[PDB]
Design a protein around this ligand. Structure first.
Ligand SMILES: Nc1ncnc2c1ncn2[C@@H]1O[C@H](COP(=O)(O)OP(=O)(O)O)[C@@H](O)[C@H]1O
Ligand SMILES: Nc1ncnc2c1ncn2[C@@H]1O[C@H](COP(=O)(O)OP(=O)(O)O)[C@@H](O)[C@H]1O
Ligand SMILES: [K+]
Ligand SMILES: [K+]
Lengths: 133, 407, 407, 133
């Protein structure tokens, strides 16, 4: 019921739209103003903020959210830095989207609860569908 | 705290002045607590509204106290207004020397006219009192009739008008004129005040002369030369000196309505005047006309005006009207007076003009208290006063845009 | 031309309606040229100000013409207001069917109350006339006393109030409520109107009840239940229907002053109401408070308001006040009437409310002409009217910034 | 008395300041707003406009000016395009600042009355000063 998604892109935006359809309260935060306006109606709360600043994260109230999904793409440093800040806020579950194998290793060692690799993870279940078909 | 000192400072001056008039040496006849507080507030927050006649109530010592409050109140705000402008006691001494010098020479000129009539002792204090009052835009007069006996006297009209025109426009305008001496090299603000004052006074003088020409009470039983003086004086006094030459209670309603706008737009910025100033009225008026004509920006005097200036001008205007609306609403419930007098009193009190139509003496105890608050808020300024007693927290979070239909 | 059609269209409707009342079949007694023009203008630019009583001046055919002008004028502006909002006759038929359906069912409910008292023929035309008048925010009444005999009748109060509340808020609000049915999913504009109307009406109802409770003329010689109805009705009628249940001429001045602000802010945007709308007042009020609190942006209902919305809201407000100021200035010179009535008449005419205190019948020929212009400009809108008759040239040159002191 | 300078840079700004000191009416036009604000007090008229648009040039009133100096630097295409537009406005004298030898050749053939090469032209007069010294 209490979910937060950081980064409204192809992967992050899809999570907000799907969660909103199921009837869940989702907080969407993104630096780009156009992304927040587009997903303003698809999220319970839409915020234009920078996730790499610890002062803004406290203003949003991320510590309240049990699940935080960091879906920042094409900016690996922002994704790595955001998750490191979230552990200081003792977030119980942090789900991070990885970009490559090296980024996957860094996120694992800095304390990411679950690492998502949308291109690689989709292949291993498309292949599973082929066997079942 | 930076804007809170001015709010606290004027409060301290008023209460000190109020108790200074309580001694049985300033006033011949006993004075009530509310009247002394009102008189001190009007003198400190330099407005000119009087519940008791200065000449017939206070003595020479008492009138000296009023003279001190006007000089302290007028110069205290003027110095801080200049400091606020430059930020957003070396300078104080320069302004004090300039203010004293111009008032002293004006008193000497006025002495040529007053001491032959009132005497060496009476004519010199009266000339000095009016020189101090006029330069600081006070409107206080020792005589029972506020300059109504000198409607056709060129010496009284010219000298006194020059004092609250020079002291009305900002001290930045005075500095820029003497430093540059070329209109092409003046700043945008200086060119707005010099051009705006000439245009606004000319329109006001034409309006007063035309509307009051046939009025038997005022401007009617006067010579043609005296009509020009009275029309000229009554056009420049509403912003913001509040001196009189005709009875405002016997004027036409149309003249009073035009005076309401005249003493709402007040005068210059960093000076002794109060009210939304002129530049604010010009900025708003030109910004709206540009929007109506489709212009993407407000352009005046070959320059451009940025949005923060536009919104600040529009913010102070609506805030000032809301305060005036609250004052009229409060006075109608409290005072059982005609509505036109109540509206005229509130605009005059907020603009610190002091013009009235038979209402200030007859105000009740609760009505006087409302006027004191209105005078204090108008003198300080709606934006400056709020910042003193409002919690400040700079936001750092943006929000998605929303569509609102404001048609 | 896009905004010029509405200005020309209403002009054509008024003159056609004015000459339609000239025939010796609409009015029993002869009607002057100015009164017919005023009556047509008030009906077309739906305001409700009447120089002659509708029942005692016009016949059944004449009242039908007034009913036609109200429906055409109210729907003509409402359809264009919706079109302007969406741009900046498929839709017209949808609005016409909705307006007729709600007015028809309201007339049937009103018929249960009126036809037992006036008759089958008289009670059905009266119910239909008031259903049309109330929904379009007209305030016209066939009876000599405008709903003053039904102060305590729940059927008259509830049905009529529902009509100019539903027709007062914008049609976008009505569409959004029925399409979404969840307050969390409403638009920012819809949430401003629904929340603003409840807050504004509650404050107005409290103000009217408290101030007029001890007034012998109004709200005094009534039962406690009737006091609630009259206070409730007099709080929602100023914006913008202008129906009566108490005599505004016998009310306290404080209630009238509060009504001036109440009927300057009007109601919904794309609807039958006129006057700076409610959202405009909220946008300005929240923008100023944010500036005073130091907020870098105006945030309300978890959203953000952009600068073009802020300046447009502030531009229409100052332009509206300037037009009202000109109307008061013009009427004071022309009409020899008490100032409070003149101010109340001008705000009512500009906001197309129609409330008056013993002034509309006694206006002179020149005074009526000024009101017609004020009613026409207020109905069209200061921004829309100017664009029709102003040369447009989009500037493409920027200028260096200039510093202006607006303190 | 009637001069116009286009491009408020190191070379263009120096002309406006020197002409203003001598008591001449100078119109300064530049796309950058900071440059126009800085030289607003040093020019009789300061305008924020683009010289490559023929519609804006007519608004300024360049045809009135007898002398127009195109001091646009680091943007050779803007300098070349501006001078070509000015000849359509039958400007009597057009002085252009060149960037290199190839730009000097292009300006000469498109009808520039006088071509200025500040780096090269200063050397030939510094060398002249050495001989006279
Ligand atoms: N520091 C940051 N804080 C919050 N959001 C960010 C930050 N940096 C980037 N983003 C957002 O993350 C999104 C990443 O999207 P993109 O790079 O297109 O890949 P994907 O759509 O797969 O996530 C961008 O839309 C951007 O707005
Ligand atoms: N299309 C244009 N129209 C007008 N002015 C321009 C245009 N393009 C560039 N400029 C101005 O010309 C100036 C060139 O300065 P710069 O490139 O630093 O070299 P220099 O200072 O030697 O001229 C810039 O400051 C810029 O503002
Ligand atoms: K004064
Ligand atoms: K109405």
């Amino acid at each position: 019921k209490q979910f937060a998604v950081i980064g409204l892109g192809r992967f992050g935006g899809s999570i907000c739209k799907e969660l909103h359809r199921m009837g869940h309260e989702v907080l969407a935060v993104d630096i780009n103003e156009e992304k927040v306006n587009a997903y303003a109606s698809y999220a319970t709360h839409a915020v234009i903020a920078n996730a790499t600043e610890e002062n803004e994260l406290l203003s949003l109230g991320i510590r309240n959210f049990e699940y935080v999904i960091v879906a920042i793409g094409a900016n690996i440093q922002a994704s790595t830095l955001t998750t490191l800040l979230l552990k200081e806020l003792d977030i119980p579950n942090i789900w991070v989207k990885a970009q490559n194998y090296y980024h996957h290793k860094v996120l694992e060692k800095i304390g990411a609860d679950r690492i998502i690799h949308p291109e690689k993870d989709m292949g291993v279940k498309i292949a599973q569908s082929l066997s079942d078909e | 705290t930076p804007p809170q000192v001015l709010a606290i400072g004027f409060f301290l001056t008023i209460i000190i002045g109020a108790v200074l008039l309580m001694l049985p040496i300033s006033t011949t006849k006993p004075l009530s607590w509310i009247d002394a507080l009102f008189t001190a507030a009007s003198a400190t927050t330099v407005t000119g509204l009087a519940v008791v006649d200065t000449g017939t109530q206070f003595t020479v010592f008492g009138q000296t106290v009023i003279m001190g409050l006007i000089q302290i109140g007028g110069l205290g705000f003027m110095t801080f207004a200049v400091l606020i402008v430059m930020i957003l006691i070396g300078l104080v001494k320069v302004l004090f020397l300039f203010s004293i010098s111009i008032e002293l020479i004006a008193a000497l000129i006025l002495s040529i006219r007053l001491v032959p009539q009132y005497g060496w002792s009476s004519g010199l204090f009266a000339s000095l009192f009016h020189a101090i009052s006029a330069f600081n835009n006070a409107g206080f007069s020792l005589w029972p009739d506020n300059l109504m006996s000198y409607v056709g006297d060129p010496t009284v009209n010219l000298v006194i008008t020059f004092l609250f025109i020079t002291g009305g426009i900002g001290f930045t305008v005075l500095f820029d004129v003497m430093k540059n001496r070329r209109f092409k090299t003046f700043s945008l603000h200086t060119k707005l005040m010099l051009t705006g004052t000439l245009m606004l006074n000319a329109i006001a003088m034409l309006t007063v002369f035309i509307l009051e020409y046939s009025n038997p009470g005022t401007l009617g039983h006067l010579h043609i030369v005296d009509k020009l003086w009275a029309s000229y004086f009554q056009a420049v006094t509403p912003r913001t000196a509040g001196f009189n030459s005709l009875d405002f209670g016997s004027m036409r309603e149309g003249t009073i309505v035009f005076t309401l706008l005249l003493m709402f737009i007040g005068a210059g910025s960093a000076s002794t005047a109060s009210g939304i100033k002129l530049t604010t009225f010009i900025v708003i008026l030109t910004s709206v006309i540009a929007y109506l004509r489709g212009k993407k920006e407000t352009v005046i005097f070959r320059r451009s005006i940025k949005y923060p200036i536009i919104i600040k001008a529009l913010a102070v205007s609506v805030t000032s009207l809301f305060i005036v609306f609250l004052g009229i609403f409060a006075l109608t419930i409290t005072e059982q007076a005609p509505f036109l007098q109540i509206v005229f009193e509130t605009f005059s009190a907020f603009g610190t003009v002091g013009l009235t139509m038979g209402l200030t003496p007859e105000l009740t105890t609760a009505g006087k208290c409302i006027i004191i608050v209105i005078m204090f808020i108008g003198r300080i300024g709606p934006l400056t006063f709020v910042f003193s007693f409002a919690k400040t927290e700079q936001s750092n979070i943006r929000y998605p845009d929303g569509e609102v239909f404001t048609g």
